[PDB]
Design a protein around this ligand. Structure first.
Ligand SMILES: [Cl-]
Lengths: 57, 57
């Protein structure tokens, strides 16, 4: 059930480096929530800036 | 189990008007996720800026 992903943030629309992997804490409609361990804050990430790690085959 | 709340955001530390009511979409450690009705955007709200609405007696 636990999902992991890579994610990135945006600075004035410019995409940042891929960060993670980190646990997908919540999955919404078009976005997820992750815990950014640098700032220790929850971040809302749009799905276009998420790379979901495929579950084990 | 559906939880609703009032929430507020701050402008340079000053708390604004209470907004909502709106559904508590996710509960984390010290913060929640809501969807802003006006902007259709997910927001992370620190618990001290949340008023959870109790169910009827
Ligand atoms: Cl946070």
């Amino acid at each position: 059930k636990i999902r992991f992903c890579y994610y990135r943030t945006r600075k004035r629309g410019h995409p940042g480096e891929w960060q993670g992997p980190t646990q997908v804490l919540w999955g919404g409609d078009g976005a997820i929530v992750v815990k950014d361990r640098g700032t220790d804050r929850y971040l809302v990430i749009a799905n276009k800036d998420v790379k979901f790690i495929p579950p084990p085959k």
